[PDB]
Symmetry: D6
Subunit: 101 residues, 12 copies
């Protein structure tokens, strides 16, 4: 069975930490990633079963909006990401977080 990727991007760092906490609390997913691209835009990346990933992104968005100064910019889930993406984009598991799989 495949490993979905879910992503929440926020403007502001405290919002992105709450997004991540809410995601890993709401469903059986692993936080693998935190990406900065400039202009205040930060993305947290989780992996898991497609439906847990759905459950976690919904939770994260709800909670990140209730952060004081919290702004959500974009979200997306990919149920079955192409194998090529792991080797280029920072969406991959690390050994640090492998205990959470």
């Amino acid at each position: 069975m495949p490993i979905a990727v879910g992503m929440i991007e926020t403007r502001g760092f405290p919002a992105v930490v709450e997004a991540a906490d809410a995601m890993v609390k709401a469903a059986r997913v692993t936080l693998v990633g935190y990406e900065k691209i400039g202009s205040g835009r930060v993305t947290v990346i989780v992996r898991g079963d497609v439906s847990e990933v759905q459950a976690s992104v919904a939770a994260g968005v709800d909670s990140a909006k209730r952060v004081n100064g919290g702004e959500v910019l974009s979200t997306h889930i990919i149920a079955r990401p192409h194998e090529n993406l792991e080797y280029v984009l920072p969406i991959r598991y690390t050994e640090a977080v492998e205990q959470f799989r």
Copy 2:
């Protein structure tokens, strides 16, 4: 349970004040400083939730009176999930273990 508190400012002097005020107001440790572009910097403290509540409150109150810059966003997570510390820069460092 070890809480995390965060104050994000516009500008560097405001964030240093946010940090100073946090650690003076309650028994919390300053563990981190994060830059995300657009002049946005966040200072991160850890400690018991009632102490983190007390310090974010003093940090905001003080950082807003800084000549220039602005408090942009703040948040307290009272019982953060294990997983967060292995990805996000909210973890203790050895340099600040002396302050627990």
Copy 3:
């Protein structure tokens, strides 16, 4: 003749979708991910020119359908000059060479 295709987005989730759509839509290899600041990110693919065309069209389409998605620029070069690969990040990496 290895064509190059690029989709630039404002925002990261949308660039990751563009990448996924591009490699799913045709026989292209995703070789790159480039950040130039200001929320602007570009994913770069390599392959037969007709494949690159199909992939960049699918990628642009899917990326716009992302919640909060913004495509900023896109382009295909059918016959990139050899000098470009030693300066600009459009070259194959060893990690993705299994995907030719």
Copy 4:
């Protein structure tokens, strides 16, 4: 005895260098730091007795404002900074400037 911290943030590099120059010329403070948070915002940090830091920050803000294209964004002085700050924020002495103490 307590070593205060003083900070002038400018939009633009030339003005931050002049702020730094005038700070160390105006009083007994060591320039310890130069901090880039991006988006054109640069901060210079001095350390010294609180009364000396106050005088130097005043000179720096005045001279920086007089730079061709000079722009001062924020300033702030902490008289008695908490010890914890130096191990996280770049407000600390470096060995290269210990000489100027």
Copy 5:
């Protein structure tokens, strides 16, 4: 004397097309790629002043066929001072020596 030619774009795909068009139009070597933020990216060529002149003209024209590209500034220096090679990223690299 080796002239320097520069084209600064907003957006990455536009700078890659500018690069390609420069080296395809004239006997010039693309030596570098500089990011300075605000989405501003410059591609740098070296060669004869007349060849650099033709390459900059092709680059500026070709950049305007890119959807979402914009050329922000350009410049040629016919006889750059030697001091510049050592401070500014306008120098040949070994990776592109084969293109002289």
Copy 6:
């Protein structure tokens, strides 16, 4: 007593012209090139105060003639405090010693 001159531009081609104009206009050494985000880039020269004044004037003049050229700020310090050397990037490098 070694002066320091700075021209800050918005855009890279224009900073490279400021640098060329400066070193050709008077007896100064270009020591540095500083990037601070938002397209803001500074070229830094060292020399005799009068040489540095001549060169900063020449530099501003020429940068303003770059297509898309923009000068944001300029300054000369005739006699910088020794402390500045060790914190700010205004120092000679070995690669440019050759040019004093």
Copy 7:
């Protein structure tokens, strides 16, 4: 359940690669590590069930000794390594080899 560690140290690189090859061919262990302490001494580290590690270390020492110029210096297996060791010594799984577990 406990993941044993197995180590073969050789004098010479080609022999360490063959030790590694034969270890993972002889039993259900993951090669996790390659450690240079200098002076020609290189160690390869496998992880797995203690009975599998024993069989793989035996195969590796035999095949390495049969290398042209092969030289085995030391070997050792720890059945139940203390958890603290992985955070200091390079005996830990990496993400690139998690696949072979």
Copy 8:
């Protein structure tokens, strides 16, 4: 007072055994691993002096029975001077704070 204990071996497998045996024999934390050439590696533990005494003793006893290599040198400092930790690699790391 926090003691430091050290066992130096010839060879890597012997040192890993030295480390394993130390942490199992008494309440000590493994903080470090040092390589100095000539096949010489040292494992460093911290803890109370009576616990460090107990663990260096078990570490030596076990590491010497390793097939190949040799225990080369050992030492316990019961109350090491502050200064040592800022120069020598005997200090706790954050990765091993969990083991105090």
Copy 9:
């Protein structure tokens, strides 16, 4: 099934000759150069088992004729386990893909 061949020498000139002798003698790609101290250096080739056997023989032969040349060890693995790629430096690099 891609074999791996290794010649280890004592001395650098001799390892560079082993490498040349190997790539010229048969259809293999030189992928690596490994240093492990005490003057011990290995050159690593990849190819068909029979090509790699031809080339290792050629390499040893030639290295032994270098003035001061010394071959310390050699080995071929016809069908290396996939796990080895990810731990040991026997993998193709992008810079030598050109040569398969």
Copy 10:
């Protein structure tokens, strides 16, 4: 008054740590440095008044010889080291150890 440099070189690391502890305990000197040059040769470097440095090197040698497996290779004190040496050789103070001056 000038800052002497004292040095103890040992074969083996536990000996070099004891050398350093004994030096800073015996006299008013600062440990600034630890240098590895290969072949098991490691040097600890202290700074202080010429006579405290003398007192500390004598203490360090005595103690390093009583280390189990302890071997001392070379020592030297320079009362008044040329200013050029700080900028090339690793004998200089660091900010970490400046609290001990």
Copy 11:
């Protein structure tokens, strides 16, 4: 075709003298300096095979006027295989291109 010439010494001063003597004797470029342990250091020149031959001979002779020097091995490859440039440190660097 660019030949490669190597001289490996024990000791550093002997390798510096070998280097100097090579470039003074013949039309060759010193491109590199390789340390492999055991006090073994190799200096690498490139040029015409006949010029590399003369430089190696001068290097070996001049090395024997150095007190405490010893030449350990030497070798010339007249026509190195292209694959070698990309693995082994025998390639020109930009810093020495001016000496071709």
Copy 12:
């Protein structure tokens, strides 16, 4: 004409003495400190050839008088070729340029 002088020792305390003696005995600048493994370290000075001679003689003499001192090799090159400074660590650094 900037001569180069080198003293190589087995052991570090002796190399530091050699350096100190060299710069005290004549008008030379200590520019380098080189490690090639195996306990071998070299200090490099630059200056007038007659100065370098005086300094290397004083350095060799003093280094031998160090408790446990061993000089391994020494050499002076009066007129080092220009190519050597871009490859070998014999060049002035900015940090020591105040000592010309």
